[PDB]
Amino acid sequence: MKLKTNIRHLHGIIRVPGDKSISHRSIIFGSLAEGETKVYDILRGEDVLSTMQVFRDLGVEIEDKDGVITVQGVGMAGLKAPQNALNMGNSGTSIRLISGVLAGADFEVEMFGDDSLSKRPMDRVTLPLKKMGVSISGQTERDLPPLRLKGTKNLRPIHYELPIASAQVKSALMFAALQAKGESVIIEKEYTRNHTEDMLQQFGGHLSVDGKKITVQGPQKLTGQKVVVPGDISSAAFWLVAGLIAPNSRLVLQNVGINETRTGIIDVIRAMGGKLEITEIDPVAKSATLIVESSDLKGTEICGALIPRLIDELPIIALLATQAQGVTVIKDAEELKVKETDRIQVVADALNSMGADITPTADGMIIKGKSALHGARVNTFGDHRIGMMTAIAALLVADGEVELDRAEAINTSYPSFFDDLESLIHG
Ligand SMILES: O=C(O)C1=C[C@@H](OP(=O)(O)O)[C@@H](O)[C@H](O[C@@](CF)(OP(=O)(O)O)C(=O)O)C1
């Protein structure tokens, strides 16, 4: 589709949709717990719907009525063999976390995904899951989907040192540990989003966190909860940058989750000199309203430790970097290559075809700032973030046109994205 170009001003209040990571987990915890769980303001992007259907296929009743998700929990050993193979679509979070969820399933199930998902490695989760007694295998040594998994009633606790900064692997193992008999210790390589840890407690579960060492005692019984989903910072991120980058702009993003393990983009905007105001802070829900203004940026360095706090924001941060004076380096981000697309190569190609000066590297990219952007055709390749990044980049194209193919990929995490864009463009 044709993207809006040469924007003159962006003014408005935006309430971004629910956090995808938390939305996914709300369905998992709701299904594994006893009693009912209700989720409010859940993200209805396609990936979360995939998670919901997966559990329905596993025998879980999940009702979406009057904007509220109601889940009738089945226990912790209540999932049942599905009639057909489980469709994980484009959701990496779904297949990886659910692989751990099924660690105790006394049956074999198949798990497939779309073209994109089938190119992502699952070995990072099968290796440790097989240590617990789970039987799992995929295509090639990397264990690419489709996967075949058979759990066991005799799950052994896990003792694992994660070789990569992955929140998904940590979470899968935590869900598994919850079913195993004994004490499991999962050691993070670097701190990653801790939504699983937070929600396990919210659902009556227990764990001990000593720095990067996470200890989970199993097996546990969880209790249904009322879950209220906060706005997704990863979605708010597209507007945070749009507001700093577009001329004569001031955007107010309300109800944005502000969990410290997810706020990496705030630190970067800071270091780059962007005008960012944080207000209406809810110290408990961990949310706030972020206000951004047209700013003149300076390049910065993004590396180790900060990476997991903003892996998903590197695509738009690259665009952000594109508008800053000087060079900005991104490293220790080899994990990008393994996302819905190789976010190093696709991001570099996409933006270079538009304004340029992005040098892809083995562990990130180097961007030389302040490029006037121009028209181009960009393909999403099934990655919602590539699409939304191009959409904001297009706003800065003074002359020319931008065609974005496979734009529907954006509905994977932000269906009303273009609606919100339109609302800011007027007034
Ligand atoms: O646990 C989670 O919910 C996530 C943590 C990160 O993945 P990882 O554990 O591999 O670093 C994130 O990169 C991941 O975000 C992505 C990655 F492509 O989600 P998917 O893996 O589900 O596609 C995204 O939406 O960009 C969501």
From Swiss-Prot:
Entry keywords, A to Z: Amino-acid biosynthesis, Aromatic amino acid biosynthesis, Cytoplasm, Transferase
Catalytic reaction(s) noted: 3-phosphoshikimate + phosphoenolpyruvate = 5-O-(1-carboxyvinyl)-3-phosphoshikimate + phosphate
Metabolic or biological pathway, per its Swiss-Prot or TrEMBL entry: Metabolic intermediate biosynthesis; chorismate biosynthesis; chorismate from D-erythrose 4-phosphate and phosphoenolpyruvate: step 6/7
Record keyword Transcription regulation present: no
Regulation: Competitively inhibited by glyphosate. Activated by ammonium, rubidium or potassium ions.
GO cellular component entries: cytoplasm
Cytoplasm is among the record's keywords: yes
Any one GO MF annotation of this record: 3-phosphoshikimate 1-carboxyvinyltransferase activity
Residues bound to 3-phosphoshikimate: S21, R25, S166, A167, Q168, D312, K339
Subcellular location: Cytoplasm
Subunit relationships: Homotetramer.
Record's function text: Catalyzes the transfer of the enolpyruvyl moiety of phosphoenolpyruvate (PEP) to the 5-hydroxyl of shikimate-3-phosphate (S3P) to produce enolpyruvyl shikimate-3-phosphate and inorganic phosphate.
Listed name of the protein: 3-phosphoshikimate 1-carboxyvinyltransferase
Species the sequence originates in: Streptococcus pneumoniae serotype 4 (strain ATCC BAA-334 / TIGR4)
Lineage, uppermost ranks: Bacteria, Bacillati, Bacillota, Bacilli, Lactobacillales
